[PDB]
Write a protein that binds this DNA or RNA. Structure first.
Ligand code: IHP
Lengths: 103, 137, 67, 402
RNA sequence: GUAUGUCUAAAGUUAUGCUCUUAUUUACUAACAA
């Protein structure tokens, strides 16, 4: 137990700290015009989310993919229709016009 | 005493052209200050209408953040380097087709810094609201 | 070589304390700085020549260039 | 019943200065408080003498213990009634509170006077902070790295291709790349060896919702100060980002910050310690934003830059107007991707038609949506082509994989 | 990345077979990226 033995302060009531309070408690006992208004005239006088709609569109990516070219085709469909689903901005319109027909 | 400070000020508050000349920045001072100071008051009033549409909680402290500027501007305590950057933001904020130029000017204003941050940040909310305000209108 | 001096001081402390704390318990409150002080004086005695030479040469170099 | 909680701004020295201490927080009261006699936190029987205080103070006292000085309570007590009862660095009241954190052992403790019903709050507070302060967590993680025992365990998963959807969710965000901060002109020397010289760069600082690409243009003047610039690039980056965040309001302070370079996360963590609410997101998915700066007008602006300035843009304008942000971002992603593969090809695709004109504000050429679609398709083909060339397996791709 | 070494840092001294276009190698170098 080193730091206990080192402890410059050890084994004491605050006899020295009460004398500090006594010295300072004695010291306790011993002891705009328009601009304020100019500013305060104005009121103060106190003083998931949209990515779910993507997640639906990416679920709609599953639809066109599930229609044409899932697994059987290596390149001819599942890669070609892969290029034509989810990646391009046009896939917004492909769903949007299906929504517009659904309306 | 205080009554004539109400009378003279509120009369002066309704007596201004809400315009910033982009060439008068080169000139030397209270004219650009009070132009901006009372242009901000219009940005305050346009807020005051659609406080139900917009989120009002942050504005209640935005007011307290703006209070320094008011005290700076009507006195000309605000520095030239700050003021030139500041007025540059407010001028671009007037034209609806300077929204790039608005936040552009705000970023170059921001880039001691304890309440200065607070109020300068509060100005960004004024652009943020105004940019939205002109959109949803 | 001041380790010798330091060691001596340590030894003194060990000696002193355990003649100073026979019936008295442990703690830091012992003074009695005499013999250690003596040690340090003798160390200074030893070194005063050494530092006269060393710092002598040093300030000479500062003033006169080195040989 | 506290009138004001003011921070007494001390020198930077105070943090680590040990001979003295000015009080960190000063506590102006509403009424007189009647604080207890000084005591430790876990010392329950706090004695309420007749002495009162109109004002307290809170001091922190960081320490780094050893195998011998590994109790904190004693130390903190010592510190308290050392600095009080010392005629250097006086506190406004001699009555106050002092916290001390043993960083070497995660042994918090605090000593000092106690306002009634305060102690529990402080105890709980310390418990909370120790459980998870950002700075302290960083420290532990730093030490952990130092000892190569880093348990790779994250609470929030990375931005992979699946979670890409849930990137954005009516939630204010920001996105960061530090790739083109330190660009170099390679030029010969008299000796014959290469000499690297810095060029102006950028801080690719994008917002996928609004499409507001901030980018503070790094003037070469900031490199002229120092050496070892690859690390310094990261630091300036994170610094700049931090500054930007500070500038913006609590609402517009972006929540989840995404970073391209996972190495540049490490100093960002540090400069994000200014504000703890801003979560960090190490992207698993590398996005092409090195090639982002090879867009014509962007590069132009970068070259133009004369000083420490930022010149923000809307990375996509017309696209927002037409469609939701995500759609725009996909197109953008494709474009940047293509650029990364090959700049010449990209530009060619963009300027295949010379009749089309890039709008004065816009970074990109304003196309009609069907021709736009075609362009996108072409770009995609370019990417696939690149893959075929390099990866040599671009034909038999699964959907998600693709 | 360095040792180290140069450089700058403001005041006026009184005289009348080839050119071309390119693509490829190899080498070296590179506190630039991987
Ligand atoms: O033997 P040293 O390495 O010189 O250390 C001694 C020794 O402490 P350790 O026994 O733990 O090493 C003394 O302890 P005792 O043998 O007397 O029990 C202790 O003396 P006190 O007990 O009188 O304190 C003294 O401490 P101090 O210097 O405060 O007198 C301390 O020296 P260090 O503190 O320099 O280690």
């Amino acid at each position: 137990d080193w730091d206990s033995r080192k402890d410059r302060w050890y084994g004491y009531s605050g006899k020295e700290y009460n004398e500090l309070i006594s010295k300072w408690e004695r010291d306790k006992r011993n002891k705009e015009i328009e601009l304020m208004k100019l500013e305060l005239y104005k009121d103060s006088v106190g003083s998931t989310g949209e990515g779910l709609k993507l997640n639906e569109l990416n679920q709609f990516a599953r639809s066109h993919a599930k229609e044409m070219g899932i697994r059987d085709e290596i390149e001819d469909k599942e890669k070609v229709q892969h290029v034509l689903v989810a990646n391009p901005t046009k896939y917004e319109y492909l769903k949007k016009k299906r929504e517009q027909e659904e309306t | 005493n205080r009554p004539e400070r109400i009378q003279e000020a509120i009369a002066q508050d309704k007596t201004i052209s809400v315009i910033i000349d982009p060439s008068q920045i080169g000139s030397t001072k209270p004219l650009l200050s009070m132009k901006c100071n009372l242009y901000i008051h219009e940005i305050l009033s346009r807020w005051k209408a659609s406080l139900e549409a917009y989120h009002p909680e942050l504005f209640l402290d935005t007011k307290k953040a703006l209070f320094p500027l008011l005290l700076q501007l009507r006195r000309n305590q605000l520095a030239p380097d700050l003021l030139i950057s500041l007025a540059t933001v407010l001028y671009h904020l007037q034209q609806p087709k300077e929204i790039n130029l608005a936040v552009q000017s705000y970023m170059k204003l921001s880039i001691i810094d304890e309440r200065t941050r607070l109020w300068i940040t509060s100005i960004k909310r004024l652009i943020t609201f105004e940019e939205w305000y002109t959109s949803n209108h | 070589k001041v380790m010798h001096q330091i060691r001596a001081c340590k030894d003194l402390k060990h000696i002193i304390y355990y003649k100073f704390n026979k019936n008295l318990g442990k703690g830091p409150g012992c003074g009695f700085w005499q013999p250690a002080w003596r040690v340090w004086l003798n160390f200074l005695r030893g070194t005063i020549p050494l530092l006269e030479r060393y710092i002598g040469n040093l300030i000479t170099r500062q003033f006169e260039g080195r040989s | 019943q506290i009138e004001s909680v003011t921070k007494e701004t001390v020198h930077p020295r105070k943090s680590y200065k040990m001979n003295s201490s000015a009080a960190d927080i000063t506590m102006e009261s509403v009424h007189e408080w009647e604080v207890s006699k000084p005591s430790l936190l876990h010392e329950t029987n706090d004695s309420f003498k007749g002495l009162i205080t109109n004002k307290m103070w809170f001091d922190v006292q960081l320490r780094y213990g050893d195998y011998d000085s590994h109790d904190i309570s004693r130390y903190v007590r010592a510190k308290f009634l050392d600095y009080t009862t010392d005629n250097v660095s006086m506190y406004p009241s001699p009555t106050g509170v002092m916290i001390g954190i043993d960083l070497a052992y995660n042994m918090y403790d605090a000593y000092g006077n106690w306002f009634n019903g305060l102690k529990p709050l402080i105890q709980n507070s310390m418990r909370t902070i120790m459980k998870a302060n950002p700075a302290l967590y960083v420290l532990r993680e730093r030490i952990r790295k130092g000892l190569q025992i880093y348990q790779s365990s994250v609470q929030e998963p990375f931005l992979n291709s699946s979670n890409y959807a849930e990137l954005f969710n009516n939630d204010i965000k920001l996105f960061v790349d530090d790739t083109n901060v330190y660009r170099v002109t390679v030029h010969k020397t008299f000796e014959g060896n290469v000499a690297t010289k810095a060029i102006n760069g950028c801080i690719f600082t994008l917002n996928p919702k609004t499409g507001h690409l901030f980018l503070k243009i790094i003037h070469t003047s900031v490199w002229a100060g120092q050496k070892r610039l690859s690390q310094l690039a990261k630091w300036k980056t994170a610094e700049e980002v931090s500054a930007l965040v500070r500038s913006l309001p609590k609402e517009e302070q972006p929540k989840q910050i995404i970073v391209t370079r996972k190495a540049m996360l490490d100093p960002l963590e540090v400069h994000m310690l200014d504000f703890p609410n801003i979560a960090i997101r190490p992207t698993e998915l590398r996005l092409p934003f090195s090639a982002a700066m090879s867009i014509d007008k962007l590069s132009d602006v970068v070259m133009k830059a004369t000083e420490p300035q930022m010149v923000l843009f809307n990375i996509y304008d017309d696209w927002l107007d037409r469609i939701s942000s995500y759609t725009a971002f996909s197109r953008l992603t494709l474009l940047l991707r293509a650029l990364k593969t090959n700049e010449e090809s990209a530009k060619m695709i963009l300027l295949s038609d010379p009749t089309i004109t890039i709008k004065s504000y816009h970074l990109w050429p304003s196309f009609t949506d069907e021709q736009w679609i075609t362009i996108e398709s072409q770009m995609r083909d370019l990417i696939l082509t690149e893959y075929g060339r390099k990866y040599n397996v671009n034909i038999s791709a699964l959907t998600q994989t693709e």
